[PDB]
Amino acid sequence: EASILTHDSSIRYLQEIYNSNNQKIVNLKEKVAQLEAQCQEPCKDTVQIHDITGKDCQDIANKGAKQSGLYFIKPLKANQQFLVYCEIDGSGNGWTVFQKRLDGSVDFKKNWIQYKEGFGHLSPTGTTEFWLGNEKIHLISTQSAIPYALRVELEDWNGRTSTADYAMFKVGPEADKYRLTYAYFAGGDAGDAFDGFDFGDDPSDKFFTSHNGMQFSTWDNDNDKFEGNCAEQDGSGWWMNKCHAGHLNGVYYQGGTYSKASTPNGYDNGIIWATWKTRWYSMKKTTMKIIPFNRLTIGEG
Amino acid sequence: EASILTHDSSIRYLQEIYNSNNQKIVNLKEKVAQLEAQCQEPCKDTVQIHDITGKDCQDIANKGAKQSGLYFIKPLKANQQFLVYCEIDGSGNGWTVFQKRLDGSVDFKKNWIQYKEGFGHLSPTGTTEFWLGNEKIHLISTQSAIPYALRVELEDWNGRTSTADYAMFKVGPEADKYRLTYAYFAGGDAGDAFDGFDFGDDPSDKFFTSHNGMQFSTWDNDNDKFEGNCAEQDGSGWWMNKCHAGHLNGVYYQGGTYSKASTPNGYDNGIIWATWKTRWYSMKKTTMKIIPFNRL
Amino acid sequence: LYIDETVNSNIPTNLRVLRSILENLRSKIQKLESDVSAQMEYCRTPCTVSCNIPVVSGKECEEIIRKGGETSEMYLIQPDSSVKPYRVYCDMNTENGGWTVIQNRQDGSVDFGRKWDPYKQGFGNVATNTDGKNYCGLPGEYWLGNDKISQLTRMGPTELLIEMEDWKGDKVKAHYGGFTVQNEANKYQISVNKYRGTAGNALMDGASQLMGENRTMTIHNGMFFSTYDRDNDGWLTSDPRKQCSKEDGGGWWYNRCHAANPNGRYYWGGQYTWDMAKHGTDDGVVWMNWKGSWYSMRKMSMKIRPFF
Amino acid sequence: LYIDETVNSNIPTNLRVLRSILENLRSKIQKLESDVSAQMEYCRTPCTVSCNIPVVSGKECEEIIRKGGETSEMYLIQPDSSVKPYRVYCDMNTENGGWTVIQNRQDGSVDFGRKWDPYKQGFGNVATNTDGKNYCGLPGEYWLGNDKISQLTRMGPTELLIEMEDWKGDKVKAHYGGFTVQNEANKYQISVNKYRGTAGNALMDGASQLMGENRTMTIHNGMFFSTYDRDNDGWLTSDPRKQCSKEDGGGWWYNRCHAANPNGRYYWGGQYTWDMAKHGTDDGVVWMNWKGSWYSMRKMSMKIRPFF
Amino acid sequence: GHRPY
Amino acid sequence: GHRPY
Amino acid sequence: IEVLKRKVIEKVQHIQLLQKNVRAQLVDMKRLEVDIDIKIRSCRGSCSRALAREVDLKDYEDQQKQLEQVIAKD
Amino acid sequence: IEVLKRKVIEKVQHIQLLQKNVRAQLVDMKRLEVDIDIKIRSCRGSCSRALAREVDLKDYEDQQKQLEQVIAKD
Ligand SMILES: *[C@@H]1O[C@H](CO)[C@@H](O[C@H]2O[C@H](CO)[C@@H](O[C@H]3O[C@H](CO[C@@H]4O[C@H](CO)[C@@H](O)[C@H](O)[C@@H]4O)[C@@H](O)[C@H](O[C@H]4O[C@H](CO)[C@@H](O)[C@H](O)[C@@H]4O[C@H]4O[C@H](CO)[C@@H](O[C@@H]5O[C@H](CO[C@]6(C(=O)O)C[C@H](O)[C@@H](NC(C)=O)[C@H]([C@H](O)[C@H](O)CO)O6)[C@H](O)[C@H](O)[C@H]5O)[C@H](O)[C@H]4NC(C)=O)[C@@H]3O)[C@H](O)[C@H]2NC(C)=O)[C@H](O)[C@H]1NC(C)=O
Ligand SMILES: *[C@@H]1O[C@H](CO)[C@@H](O[C@H]2O[C@H](CO)[C@@H](O[C@H]3O[C@H](CO[C@H]4O[C@H](CO)[C@@H](O)[C@H](O)[C@@H]4O)[C@@H](O)[C@H](O[C@H]4O[C@H](CO)[C@@H](O)[C@H](O)[C@@H]4O[C@H]4O[C@H](CO)[C@@H](O[C@@H]5O[C@H](CO[C@@]6(C(=O)O)C[C@H](O)[C@@H](NC(C)=O)[C@H]([C@H](O)[C@H](O)CO)O6)[C@H](O)[C@H](O)[C@H]5O)[C@H](O)[C@H]4NC(C)=O)[C@@H]3O)[C@H](O)[C@H]2NC(C)=O)[C@H](O)[C@H]1NC(C)=O
Ligand SMILES: [Ca+2]
Ligand SMILES: [Ca+2]
Ligand SMILES: [Ca+2]
Ligand SMILES: [Ca+2]
């Protein structure tokens, strides 16, 4: 017969495609490793930490720095540095805010320890509620014999804003219940609400709502000039007295303004600044900066 | 008879002694004029005022001046120069003291006004307790953008003096009650008492006895961080707060060292510098100099 | 003498088999070519994640919770003055709460078959956003710096929790009130003791599906850290091809080789046979004592915390 | 006739008298020579006085008291920015307190018979020590510069107090709620009105011990200031010898010549006759009105202060 | 002491 | 996984 | 006379070995399906988007039986 | 011959005018006493010390009367 000699010729086709496969695979596994390398990196974190650690944000801005993000600082007196959202206006100054309020979703009805260590989070864009920490704040305002200043900036659901600067600003040690106490009131188109504003009840207020020299109070820590722990009543932490005359940590009311009925018991709180907006008008944005006196803020340039 | 012609011979003696009289009188009235001119000058006043009026004592030493006494100065902002006991160490600096304590008898329990215009008396020697005057001290530290300093010098009833320098020193106008404020504490082997020395009562003190930013209070002017018109409670004026943590206008206790009983009410005061001596130890000599910052 | 007729009947049916099989493959591959090419195009624009650092800070997660650290997001700690603070994820809810997550798996979002160095420095994603919310609450799989892991444990007593769950949901875990990894100098040894929980003491008791020399060689406790970049296994062999790490891509405290393979090859579905493994072994995050040499977890995680 | 015998009787007796009177003078004179010579030697060493200038200051004495100036010692004032501050003596006690002493007498310690310039410039001792005490609270006779005196008054309403007393103690004084001396360019006029107090309006009503033309020619008011160095009296005559100031040694607002002569010749005891006056007139600080042309006071003072 | 005419 | 000898 | 019994078996070796060759190809291939898949997931923590794709293990082992069904043939 | 009535009066004139000259002396003297006394005092506000001396007016007026007692009668 011997005619069948043909089917065997068909094999050339298999070993030929098989060769292509094997060859292709080698070239493929080859590209795989190229992918493993190229594509194998941690996500890109929009949030970044800068260097040039210093005494505070103003020393950061004193050692270069021009951006307004989060850095690290480590006070002479204390130890272990910690993040701190600065704010270098670029004029040559670098504020070091310790509290900010926007969104409104962050809460302040936190206990004592929580306030001593701070809560919330810090952000580069600088948009995120947060309270540094009574302990941090202290170490910052005490280090050296250099006076510090505070700029309580706020804003309404209108869009306009007002400032308030106080000199020699500085909070005592925990041993004294982080007592707040400055020297005098400097400029400020928001009004001296820390001077105790006598709304309209009792010849009191003026010598009852001033926060100069007051201690800090919390839901479970009473160190104010009133038995009734204001905290519990209100729902925050502050240097209470009669109590608040402009505390800015109360509930963040959406849209601003509220009534005595919006609250369970029927009291009032929320970020208010007597010397500027009614005692029943919550803020939309808040912020507490802080820079050594000698700096520009009513100092020089 | 005619024999008597002898007595008329006596006449010569009278006329002669007479001429001597008229003559000496002219020589005498002549000398009187010499005396009126010689002996007709105002007594010599040991105390002397030097010229070369300036912005402050440091200008006086900048415009020459090598002696240490009283000069007249006139700050740029105000006018009507005044007296101010300087202090030129010759090294090329001329301190301007606005408050000095020695003797002890001068008192500082004056009302507000008295402190505004100062009190006591200055002296060339430099030995006489005095207080320039809040107004003066103000304008002297407010003129120009040129910083100043302060050198709180003290001395114990031992003999060892100490110092204390503070930069950017300057007291505001009376409008703000002569608020005293600076930038920081420079050197000082006496210690920073204007910082707030917390003795041992309450976790306060520190944040209550500091004087950077406070106002000025007096027996009849309370502008402190205490309704407590301290000056009454004490017996002087200062920039109270808790109050004193180092005010040196209180009582001058003879020999230094006093007790809680030595006071009429039972409180304490008097020249004390917390960060140097006991809250109950009165100085012997004090002094507040002031020079622009660039001087060191 | 006639046996020849079978050449036309048997061989043909075979050619039909190769044709289908071979042709099926030329296509299966073309399909893969476009994928690798397309994916390659993707990591040309990396992933973005915004993690706002919480103000509250400490040394470990333990401290943070006792400093007002309620929420279970990632944090920033500084276990030492002579070491750069670093992010990390702190679990604040599981068993008392306040655990310092050191390793975690859940989707294979990152490859653990990295070299030795990436394992000393640390790799992976510490934490991702929480669907719109500004902070980072969700984990993300990673492996904190070995040097940190060692430094952490070598400064005070420590314990360890290793929970995990299959693809059915069922959860279990291991507890070691004694955990301590030496410094790089000593090959990141791993001396753990004081077992607890239910899932299998394979870290110091070796597997359960083995006996004698077979089992007693899979006790991780005491071994060194190995990577397909550096071999420190308890497998003594000259053939560089035979190395625990390479066999099962991923840095672990191997030892001829394991009874538990965290940081392996996150296999999907959960089940897998021998003819799937990169080398044909049993790679992939498996505990074996609760599942088997052929079952890759759905979620594998570790976390440390002070003793006392 | 025989009248000769009276020569030996009369002439001798006179000779005895002249001898007594003449010889008595020679010694009387040698007596004075010793004094003049001696006193002369003393002025070879002037007096020393030390006055610590008080810190408190102002324009006049009124400002000082209302500035904490209770004690009555010498101060430092400056009634104008364009003039050098000078010493002075502030009386902070007498009637209300705060009077600026402008001139004073009390012991003749300083001669007021000076030329014109001295009176323009000012002379005398503003103040002396207080028996040990560092500061100067005691007076001492003087006359502050005219120009100052003029300048003082010509800058706001002013008044004057001219107290004085005999050697019997009895005191009295004048009060003019309107005092003003003009500038040196106007021979230092003196326009005083608004009389008061008891002692005699001998400064604008003339003397009481006279009448008509005699009296109305002794009104100091509106006169000029004269000195034996410069004549500005109301006495019109050509004889250089005849001039108020030369007669009654001293500068004043003479007018042919005075009804009151402050700044005269401080005599002792209090009384004196014409045959003692330097010229034979009636010099010496005398008010005459309260006492008489023959009686120099024991103390004579003047002081100013605003009207308000 | 006045000066007559 | 273990490894035979 | 080489045609009667000889030509039948002497020629089959070409396909016999190739037959063994594919079994290795599949096995070696299967592992690739796994590796790739696993690797792809790696991009989730690196590559913007993650290309989700199913891996057919059924087909393979289904073809593996054809290979295993045509074994001993000689 | 001129010795009888003449010698008496012609001779007295020298003492007559002299008798007046002494008076003019006293008065011119009396003032010195005064002026000097007053001038001495001015030395207090100048001379370190000041000489203290008594002024005798009595003696003068006393002697004055003697001079006044011997006027016209010759
Ligand atoms: C510690 O643990 C180890 C386990 O790792 C364990 O190992 C033991 O392994 C066997 C099993 O008990 C024993 O072997 C010795 O004793 C045997 C006695 O004879 C018979 O054994 C059977 C079953 O045991 C009894 O039922 C009978 O009554 C009878 O007694 C004897 O068979 C052995 O002879 C072999 O000698 C050596 C190995 O010892 C070997 O080189 C020789 O070729 C000879 O042949 C046998 O061994 C070879 C290779 O090891 C096998 O050939 C391989 O076959 C596979 C086929 O597929 C499988 C499989 O083997 O079944 C399926 C698996 O599920 C799969 N697993 C994987 C890797 O994922 C794989 C997979 O399919 C392949 O990888 C891909 O194809 O393998 C495959 O084709 C291989 O390529 C091929 O090489 C034969 O199976 C076998 N003979 C046959 C035809 O059946 C020997 O004398 C010992 O007990 C022991 N051996 C060792 C490793 O030492 C230890 O016992 C245990 N020790 C303890 C107690 O601590
Ligand atoms: C405004 O003011 C003016 C002047 O300030 C007033 O002017 C008046 O001036 C006379 C003031 O006495 C008035 O005189 C009238 O009244 C006399 C008083 O006597 C009356 O009463 C007796 C009672 O028995 C009666 O007998 C008599 O008739 C009178 O009614 C009266 O005496 C006057 O008479 C005279 O008449 C004319 C002048 O008008 C002369 O020609 C006569 O001489 C006569 O005598 C007068 O003149 C005498 C000679 O000049 C004076 O005398 C004495 O002279 C003394 C001089 O001697 C020495 C010397 O240097 O030489 C010696 C010695 O050293 C010393 N003496 C001693 C030791 O004390 C004195 C001494 O230095 C001086 O005193 C210094 O001042 O000098 C000496 O001057 C002495 O004081 C004289 O007494 C003498 O002036 C006078 N006689 C006497 C005894 O007084 C006449 O009638 C006028 O009325 C009046 N002027 C006239 C005339 O207008 C005026 O009144 C007043 N107006 C008003 C109302 O506002
Ligand atoms: Ca309370
Ligand atoms: Ca009080
Ligand atoms: Ca090995
Ligand atoms: Ca004339």
Residue among C170, C235, C160 nearest C201 (CA): C160
Directed axis angle between helix G13-42 and helix G57-69, to 10°?
170
Q: List every span in chain D annotated with CATH 3.90.215.10.
A: 52-199+299-308
- Identify the bridge partners of residue B50 per DSSP, sorted by sequence position: B71
Asked whether the beta carbons of residue G46 and residue A25 sit closer than 8 angstroms, the reply is no
Tokens of A191: 């009004």
Q: C-alpha angle B270/B230/A214, rounded to 5°?
A: 120
Angstrom distance (rounded) from CA A136 to CA A155: 25
Q: Are A274 and A81 in contact (CB under 8 A)?
A: no
3-state secondary structure of A248: coil
The sign of the torsion formed by the CA atoms of A49, A54, A55, A58 equals negative
Which amino acid would we find at residue B60?
A: I
Name, in order, each residue with C-beta under 8 angstroms of D179's C-beta and a sequence gap of 6 or more.
Answer: D153, D158, D159, D160, D190, D192, D304
3-state secondary structure of C129: strand
Which amino acid would we find at residue D240?
A: P
For β-strands B44-45 and D48-49, DSSP reports them as: parallel
Q: Specify the number of domains making up chain H.
A: 1
Tokens of B32: 């009187």
- E strand or H helix at A217: strand A217-218
Q: C-alpha angle B168/B170/B173, rounded to 5°?
A: 150
- Domain of G55, CATH number, reads 1.20.5.50
DSSP string of chain B?
-GGGTTGGGGHHHHHHHHHHHHHHHHHHHHHHHHHHHHS--PPEES--EEEEEESSHHHHTTTS--S-SEEEE--SSS-S-EEEEEEE-SSS-EEE-SEEE-SSTT-----HHHHHT-EEB--SSS-S-EE--HHHHHHHHHSSS--EEEEEEEE-SSS-EE--EEET--B--GGGTS-B--SEE---TT--GGGT---SSSS-GGGTS--TT---BBTTB--SSSSS-HHHHSSS-B--SSS-SS---S---TTS---GGGSSSS---SS--TTTS-TT---SEEEEEEEEGGG-
Q: Are A4 and G8 in contact (CB under 8 A)?
A: no
Bond preceding residue D257 cis, omega within 30 of 0: yes
Q: How far is D28 from chain B (nearest CA, A)?
A: 10
Tokens of A115: 């306030």
CB atoms within 10 A of CB A143: 19
Bond preceding residue A243 cis, omega within 30 of 0: yes
Name, in order, each residue with C-beta under 8 angstroms of B260's C-beta and a sequence gap of 6 or more.
Answer: B266, B267, B268, B280
Asked whether the beta carbons of residue C218 and residue F2 sit closer than 8 angstroms, the reply is yes
Comparing alpha-carbon positions, the chain D residue that sits nearest to B135 is D56
Which ligand gives the minimal distance to the CA of A225? Answer: 3
Main-chain phi, psi angles of B218, to 5 degrees = -145, 165
The sign of the torsion formed by the CA atoms of B189, A175, A100, C69 equals positive
Name, in order, each residue with C-beta under 8 angstroms of D153's C-beta and a sequence gap of 6 or more.
Answer: D179, D180, D181, D304
Distances (CA, A) of B125 to A42, B15, B129, D134, D182: 79, 63, 12, 12, 40
User: Chain A partners of C109 at a C-beta cutoff of 8 Å?
Assistant: none
Domain that residue H18 falls in: 1-74
C200-298 topology per CATH: Gamma-fibrinogen Carboxyl Terminal Fragment; domain 2 (4.10.530)
Q: Are C190 and C253 in contact (CB under 8 A)?
A: yes
Q: List every span in chain C annotated with CATH 4.10.530.10.
A: 200-298
Tokens of B277: 């001596």
Angstrom distance (rounded) from CA A102 to CA A120: 12
Which amino acid would we find at residue C89?
A: Y
Q: How far is D129 from chain B (nearest CA, A)?
A: 11
**Class of residue D107 by CB neighbours under 10 A (exposed 0-12, middle 13-18, buried 19+):** middle
Which amino acid would we find at residue C188?
A: Y
Instruction: Report which protein residue has its CA nearest ligand 2's atom 74.
Output: D274
Rg (CA), chain G: 20
* Range list of H helices, chain C: 6-42, 61-65, 117-121, 146-153, 202-205, 244-247
What long-range pairs does D25-34 form, CB within 8 A, spacing at least 24?
A: D25/B21, D25/H25, D25/H26, D25/H29, D26/B17, D26/B20, D26/B21, D26/B24, D28/H29, D28/H59, D29/B21, D29/B24, D29/B25, D29/B28, D29/H29, D30/B24, D32/B28, D32/H32, D32/H33, D32/H36, D33/B24, D33/B28
Tokens of B82: 């005044």
Q: Which chains have 3 or more CB–CB distances shorter than 8 Å to chain D?
A: B, E, H
The conformation of residue D197, written as its DSSP 8-state character, comes to: S
Q: Are D20 and H59 in contact (CB under 8 A)?
A: no
**CATH number attached to the domain at D52-199+299-308:** 3.90.215.10
For β-strands A237-238 and A217-218, DSSP reports them as: antiparallel
Name, in order, each residue with C-beta under 8 angstroms of D256's C-beta and a sequence gap of 6 or more.
Answer: D217, D218, D233, D234, D235, D244, E2, E3
Angstrom distance (rounded) from CA B42 to CA B45: 9
Q: C-alpha angle B108/B110/B112, rounded to 5°?
A: 125
Q: C-alpha angle B204/B206/B212, rounded to 5°?
A: 125
- E strand or H helix at A154: strand A148-155
Distances (CA, A) of C133 to A106, C49, C57, C129: 11, 11, 21, 7
- Identify the bridge partners of residue A55 per DSSP, sorted by sequence position: none
For β-strands A99-101 and A285-288, DSSP reports them as: antiparallel
Query: In Å, what resolution does this model reach?
Result: 3.6
**Class of residue B101 by CB neighbours under 10 A (exposed 0-12, middle 13-18, buried 19+):** buried
Distances (CA, A) of A180 to A84, A172, A220, B20: 20, 6, 19, 99
Q: Are A51 and A64 in contact (CB under 8 A)?
A: no
C1-51 topology per CATH: 1.20.5
Q: Please choose from C214, C273, C279, C281 the residue to mutate so as to test ligand 1's pocket, defined by most ligand atoms within 8 A of CB.
A: C214
* Ligand 2, CB within 6 Å, residue ranges: D 211-214, 274; E 4
Q: How far is the CA of H15 from the centre of ligand 2 (A)?
A: 29
User: Chain A partners of C36 at a C-beta cutoff of 8 Å?
Assistant: 28, 31-32, 35
**Class of residue G55 by CB neighbours under 10 A (exposed 0-12, middle 13-18, buried 19+):** middle
Q: How far is the CA of C276 from the centre of ligand 1 (A)?
A: 20
Residue among A136, A112, A131, A110 nearest A215 (CA): A112
Asked whether the beta carbons of residue D35 and residue H53 sit closer than 8 angstroms, the reply is yes
Angstrom distance (rounded) from CA C203 to CA C219: 6
The sign of the torsion formed by the CA atoms of A234, A236, A242, A248 equals negative
Angstrom distance (rounded) from CA B218 to CA B208: 18
All structural domains of chain A: 48-190+285-296 (3.90.215.10), 191-284 (4.10.530.10)
Angstrom distance (rounded) from CA B201 to CA B208: 11
Q: How far is C43 from chain G (nearest CA, A)?
A: 4
Q: Are D185 and D197 in contact (CB under 8 A)?
A: no
- E strand or H helix at G17: helix G13-42
- E strand or H helix at H7: helix H7-10
Residue among C91, C60, C56 nearest C158 (CA): C60
For β-strands A148-155 and A285-288, DSSP reports them as: antiparallel
Using CB atoms, pick whichever of A173, A183, A293 lies closest to residue B203. A173
Residue among G53, A41, A33 nearest C249 (CA): A33
Q: Are C270 and C298 in contact (CB under 8 A)?
A: yes
Residue listed under structure tokens 């941690």 = A42
- Which ligand 1 atom is nearest residue C280's CA? 69
Q: Which of residues 11-30 of G touch A (CB under 8 A)?
A: 11, 14-15, 18, 21-22, 25, 28-29
